[PDB]
Amino acid sequence: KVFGRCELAAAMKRHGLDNYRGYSLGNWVCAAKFESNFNTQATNRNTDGSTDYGILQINSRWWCNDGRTPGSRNLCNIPCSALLSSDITASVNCAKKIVSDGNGMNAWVAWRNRCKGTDVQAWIRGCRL
Ligand SMILES: [Cl-]
Ligand SMILES: [Cl-]
Ligand SMILES: [Cl-]
Ligand SMILES: [Cl-]
Ligand SMILES: [Cl-]
Ligand code: NA
């Protein structure tokens, strides 16, 4: 499912990301735009053979099981495929674990490079929230 910006900001807010670990909603919406284009089915394969999955591009090296990242973990204890659903619940629950891991939103490279330090509230202006 490909969300629009405000649709996804609403959903995200509804699953409790606004100010989660101190990260205001716009951080999350920014991250998702640049990670996945707001597409829940996005998948990308990394150089180590792991893969990133879903609207927040969560990686199999550590967070989910895909059966083809040898040596890896499944800390979210989910198939990676659950991160591809039209319902964002499993991606959000897993994103909450990740952001609580030590490095905050720096886990998301696109966040660091494109969202961190910017006026992220732009991303939720004009949304019904
Ligand atoms: Cl947009
Ligand atoms: Cl595996
Ligand atoms: Cl959803
Ligand atoms: Cl932090
Ligand atoms: Cl914000
Ligand atoms: Na894994």
Domains of the chain: 1-129 (1.10.530.10)
Distance 56 CA to ligand 1 centre (A): 15
Number of the ligand closest to the Cα of 25: 5
Distance, CA of 108 to CA of 86 (rounded, Å): 21
User: Phi/psi at 78 (nearest 5 deg)?
Assistant: -150, 150
How is residue 9 written in tokens?
């900001």
Number of the ligand closest to the Cα of 79: 6
One-letter amino acid of 50: S
Three-class DSSP category at 65: strand
Distance 90 CA to ligand 6 centre (A): 15
Distance, CA of 56 to CA of 94 (rounded, Å): 10
For residue 52, which of 77, 30, 69 has the smallest C-alpha distance?
Answer: 69
Where is 116: in which H helix or E strand? none
Distances (CA, A) of 23 to 2, 40, 66: 23, 21, 29
Q: Taking each helix axis as running N to C, give the angle between helix 25-36 and helix 5-14, from 0 to 180 degrees, rounded to the nearest 10.
A: 130
According to the annotation, is 101 in a ligand binding site? yes
Distance 63 CA to ligand 2 centre (A): 11
Method: X-ray
DSSP 87: S
Distance, CA of 14 to CA of 33 (rounded, Å): 18
- Starting at the edge strand that comes first in sequence, how are the strands of the sheet with 58-59 ordered? 43-45, 51-53, 58-59
For residue 32, which of 50, 15, 46 has the smallest C-alpha distance?
Answer: 15
DSSP 66: -
Residues annotated as catalytic (active site), given as ranges: 35, 52
